[PDB]
């Protein structure tokens, strides 16, 4: 398949600003190569076609260019209606005709630590045999965050799950909800559980922790 | 105005089938190419295959590993996908969309898949699980702000819902997307950041409903 490298896949940004995305492909495509944009929870909308020809309703601001290898969507005024996830698609081979791997347009504040909380089990779960060990990184920004859980001192890997929530109406903040999953018996053995975050907003990670 | 809705989806069981169902409407269905595309939860656009108007071509992703068939009954504005085989991995949004076909500004006589994809319908979301109904075991997130919450863990299939106070609280409340755990069954959590001041004198209560298994649940959250 015909490889399609988009970058950047985050860019926040803020009214006013212009944005440009970059799509290239492993092998030459010519001018067949088209940009879509996908808000939350909708369907993709076709915005150029043959590299640099816009669909009917597209606004003017919206613009691409390029050929061969190397393409190029730019929005030269961004409003509000633009935050969107956007794609590139190259339409010169098939199968399979593939897509970029998305640009994820948001509304540009500034840096925020999160506020980091760590949640024991209950007493409840324990009882049926699980412990759930829960961090929380509360209202950060931007959405880029890592954590790592330590069992007295041991870096747990494969044994947490994560998710993170739509970044937020009023103060353009994410949060983040991290699971640590172990047996109630493995629970019993340990003392110290701890949840380290790293986040551009802190210059050393922060770690939270309680002892069972 | 011109449109493509889907329909056909829903829950299957790992190794079993389904039909997917596309209509269009206001054009004429026969003179155009048709595509399939699909969005796994969280992921980018993946293109799976394709049909000419004619039906005497078709393509189909490597991902669909040869196992799915696309169709179309133009007397019917119709176009299907048979997936067989299926696969938790095959979880995702469907979409059905149109050729634009030509590089002018309004296509008469419509070529193949060059110039991109200009109608997309809504989707139909397709979950592949072997798991059983059931409802949630709701557990406390016990807490100058603090944090609380509830962890709502091992329930089957999506939706839940949660509510603060039944409704009343709303502000600084964080309701996370779930995550599938390796058994099969979601796990979701919501959160609210309050000021600690209010801990000894304030009643927090996570109202938790999973309408699939009739399963309702007020949970009261206090200091352990």
């Known amino acids: 398949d015909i490889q399609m490298t988009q970058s950047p896949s985050s860019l926040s940004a803020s009214v006013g600003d212009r944005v440009t995305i970059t799509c290239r492909a492993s092998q030459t495509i010519s001018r067949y190569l088209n940009w879509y944009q996908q808000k939350a929870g909708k369907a993709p909308t076709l915005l150029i076609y043959?590299?640099?020809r816009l669909q009917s309703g597209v606004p003017s601001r919206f613009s691409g260019s390029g050929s061969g290898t190397e393409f190029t969507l730019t929005i030269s005024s961004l409003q509000r209606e633009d935050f969107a996830t956007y794609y590139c698609?190259?339409?010169?081979?098939?199968?399979?005709?593939?897509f970029g791997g998305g640009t994820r347009v948001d509304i540009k504040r500034t840096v925020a630590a999160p506020s980091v909380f760590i949640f024991p089990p209950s007493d409840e779960q324990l009882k049926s045999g699980t412990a759930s060990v829960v961090c929380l990184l509360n209202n950060f920004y931007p959405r880029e965050a890592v954590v790592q859980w330590k069992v007295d001192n041991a870096l747990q890997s494969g044994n947490s799950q994560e998710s993170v929530t739509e970044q937020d109406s009023k103060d353009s903040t994410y949060s983040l909800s991290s699971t640590l999953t172990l047996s109630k018996a493995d629970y019993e053995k340990h003392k110290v559980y701890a949840c380290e975050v790293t986040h551009q907003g802190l210059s050393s990670p922060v770690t939270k922790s309680f002892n069972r | 105005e011109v449109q493509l809705v889907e329909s056909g989806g829903g829950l299957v069981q790992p190794g079993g089938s389904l039909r997917l169902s596309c209509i269009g409407s206001?054009?004429?269905?026969?003179?155009?190419?048709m595509n399939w595309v699909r969005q796994a939860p969280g992921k980018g656009l993946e293109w799976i295959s394709y049909?000419?108007?004619?039906?005497?071509?078709?393509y189909y992703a490597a991902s669909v590993r040869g196992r799915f068939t696309i169709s179309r009954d133009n007397a019917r504005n119709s176009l299907f996908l048979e997936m067989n085989g299926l696969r938790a991995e095959d979880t995702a949004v469907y979409y059905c969309?149109?050729?634009?076909?030509?590089?002018?500004?309004?296509?008469?006589?419509?070529?193949?898949?060059?110039?991109?994809?200009?109608?997309w319908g809504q989707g139909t979301t397709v979950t592949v699980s072997s798991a059983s109904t059931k409802g949630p075991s709701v557990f406390p997130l016990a807490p100058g702000t603090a944090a609380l919450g509830c962890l709502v863990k091992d329930y089957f299939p999506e939706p839940v819902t949660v509510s603060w106070n039944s409704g009343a609280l709303t502000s600084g409340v964080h309701t996370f997307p779930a995550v599938l755990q390796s058994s099969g069954l979601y796990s979701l959590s919501s959160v609210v950041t309050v000021p600690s001041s209010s801990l000894g004198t304030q009643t927090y209560i996570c109202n938790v409903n999973h309408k699939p298994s009739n399963t309702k649940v007020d949970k009261k959250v206090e200091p352990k």
């Open positions: 049909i000419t108007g004619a039906s005497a071509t078709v």
């Open positions: 969309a149109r050729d634009r076909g030509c590089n002018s500004p309004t296509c008469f006589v419509i070529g193949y898949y060059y110039y991109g994809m200009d109608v």
């Open positions: 043959d590299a640099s």
């Open positions: 698609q190259q339409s010169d081979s098939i199968p399979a005709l593939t």
């Open positions: 206001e054009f004429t269905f026969s003179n155009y190419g």
